[PDB]
Write a protein that binds this ligand. Structure first.
Ligand SMILES: *[C@@H]1O[C@H](CO)[C@@H](O)[C@H](O)[C@H]1NC(C)=O
Ligand SMILES: *[C@@H]1O[C@H](CO)[C@@H](O)[C@H](O)[C@H]1NC(C)=O
Ligand SMILES: *[C@@H]1O[C@H](CO)[C@@H](O)[C@H](O)[C@@H]1O
Ligand SMILES: [Ca+2]
Ligand SMILES: [Ca+2]
Lengths: 413, 319
């Protein structure tokens, strides 16, 4: 029969966290739902208000002679007045009635529209990008002007983006592979048998990888977003799974410590086709089968709307593609890049030392991320039949099979 | 309630003192922005930005058992006085991100498929058996951007928390079902803005293929001499599902299909250009709405526990 969402009992509640003015509760997921039963939508934990059972400790975490900004954030005095968006929000106008001097002197430099997005959060579940933990509109008083980028225009590189180098690389891989076959035979009162069979196989693989450089994030002196540091300040300090999962679900299990920008296209045709016949009379019989799979798939990512969706389908069809259609799509990757692949750093590496209780939060995050990877596992689900495998999705385990066996568990043929 | 040193709001909210003067509608109908005209200090230092129409509707309510208002309990007019921004690579326009939405990533990611599997078998002796299974699929995705939204520090519409302050402490099933349809049964904590199609050909190929068309020719005519297939009555049984875009281009694609004719590649790109106006959600990750009920609510855990007792009854209220 079909399969429903299931969970443990809830655990015993927390004490009241005196400065956070809340209490916390949590529960384990045990079945997601499957085979089109009752799909999960169900939470890992819950929180309740309390008048706290003890005093809160002194909140302020002041860095000293550094300027304490209107954000959660400290900054060094060379950046108190710098003609720039220092310290994570504008916080300076009442001081900077003098000393306007910019990082870039007499110049007109623009922001790198790639570097602002560098250091995506990533969730290891599905490997979706999330907006940066990193500030990337902070420049540390450095001008650090790059003339780089294929559109021959200068930009200012933001402090956390240690490298952004436009290594252009364009690759195409193409493979075709056919094997094609036929076998046939033949052999008052009379006898005969006639036999024939034919097989056709094609595998095409194509991929085109187009780079727009690579970013490497800085491994010391990282300046983080006001929202992220605040979302680390507002933590239980006691390993409440559901509350830590709420931070993973807004900034990722990892961040891309370095990532490769650009675009990709990929195409497959697989065709695998067979027909078999026998006929005979012996002093009538006539016995046949046909088996075909035909599956063509196209992926395009990166570039602008028009060119990508043109090229996506032109390439899927029989069409002999115009080189200038490729040039347009591949040029538009300048305007609209996508993250091709990247190196992942566990997110707790961005819990800054020189914040209160930092190392306790890190060991909690390290445990919590391990739990977040465990109770979302596929290994708990019931088995697929025949040649399929257990796919995982939010609130369902399932399988599907382009192989003449059928249903949401591939059980029938 | 009192907001301490910060400002108390009409229809019930607390706005941090630095927000009030900024231009950002912090307390609804610009009622934050009674006189501060000596210090009207903006969130953005004269930088050009236009508000994100895709994301202003993000965080739609959804119900498995009689569909929800497709509307936001979240207040996507709120920005915490930040200027943080995501931009359209297609028109090179910057948008502010509503502070509910933890991430916008505009990601041009088209995918497409065409597929058939077919089996036939016959055994005959003048025991016997005969079998068919056949289909043709065309499937497509158009993807405009990911959204993901907060699980804490959420700022709701005042009209949503009002609809919690009006709930009784008791289970009151009729009133709790009124709320659970007034805003939603569940919310997408994340989703995928775009458009989608599925155009299954229920046509068994032999229905035409006994007349002068080959398998490679009918595939050629779909995406041809050997008959005039576009003139002929022969193509009939094609389904249409089509999600998002401007109704003209959705109609043109449907009209061509119900006429038994192929859509031109010109058409699909025209449709894909129009998903910028009128997006739909291709997939969603779901949580029940009680997770939005603020921890400050005067019987908060009791109301949330009764919303769980109410959500549980919808599954029995319908077959
Ligand atoms: C028998 O022969 C006919 C004529 O070629 C063929 O169409 C059919 O598939 C064969 N199989 C049967 C009738 O079992
Ligand atoms: C096939 O018939 C249609 C009318 O249904 C006609 O417009 C078309 O010209 C014929 N063949 C061609 C040229 O497509
Ligand atoms: C944990 O589950 C218990 C059921 O034993 C409830 O009382 C509570 O609301 C929480 O969900
Ligand atoms: Ca300054
Ligand atoms: Ca305001």
């Amino acid at each position: 029969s079909h399969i429903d969402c299931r969970m443990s009992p809830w655990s015993e509640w927390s004490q009241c966290d005196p400065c956070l003015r809340q209490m916390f509760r949590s529960r384990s997921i045990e079945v997601f739902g499957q085979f089109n039963g009752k799909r999960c939508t169900d939470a890992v934990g819950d929180r309740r208000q309390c008048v706290p059972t003890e005093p809160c400790e002194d909140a302020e975490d002041d860095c000293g002679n550094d300027f304490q900004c209107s954000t959660g954030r400290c900054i060094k005095m060379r950046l108190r007045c710098n003609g720039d968006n220092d310290c994570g929000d504008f916080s300076d106008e009442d001081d900077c009635e003098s000393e306007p001097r910019p990082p870039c002197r007499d110049r007109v430099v623009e922001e790198s529209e790639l570097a602002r997005t560098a250091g995506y959060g990533i969730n290891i579940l599905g490997m979706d990008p999330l907006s940066t933990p990193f500030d990337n509109e902070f420049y540390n008083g450095l001008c650090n002007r790059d003339r780089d980028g294929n559109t021959l225009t200068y930009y200012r590189r933001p402090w956390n983006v240690a490298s952004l180098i436009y290594e252009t690389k364009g690759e195409k891989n193409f493979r075709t592979e056919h094997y094609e076959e036929q076998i046939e035979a033949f052999k008052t009162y009379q006898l005969f048998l006639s036999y024939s069979s034919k097989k056709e196989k094609m595998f095409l693989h194509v991929k085109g990888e187009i780079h727009l450089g690579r970013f490497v994030m800085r491994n010391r002196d990282v300046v983080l977003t006001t929202t992220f540091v605040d979302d680390i300040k507002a933590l239980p300090t006691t390993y409440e799974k559901g509350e830590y999962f709420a931070f993973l679900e807004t900034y990722g299990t990892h961040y891309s410590s370095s990532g490769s920008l650009g675009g990709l296209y990929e195409l497959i045709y697989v065709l695998d086709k067979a027909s078999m016949k026998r006929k005979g009379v012996e002093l009538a019989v006539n016995i046949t089968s046909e088996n075909l799979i035909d599956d063509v798939v196209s992926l395009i990512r990166g570039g602008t709307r028009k060119y990508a969706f043109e090229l996506k389908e032109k390439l899927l069809r029989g069409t002999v593609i115009d080189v200038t259609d490729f040039v347009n799509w591949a040029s538009s990757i300048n305007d609209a890049p996508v993250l091709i692949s990247q190196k992942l750093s566990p997110i707790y590496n961005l819990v800054p030392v020189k914040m209160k209780n930092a190392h306790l939060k890190k060991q909690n995050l390290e445990r919590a991320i391990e739990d977040y990877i465990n109770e979302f596992s596929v290994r708990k689900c019931h088995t697929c039949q025949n040649g399929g495998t257990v796919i995982l999705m939010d609130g369902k385990c399932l399988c599907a099979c382009p192989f003449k066996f059928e249903g949401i568990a591939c059980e029938i043929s």
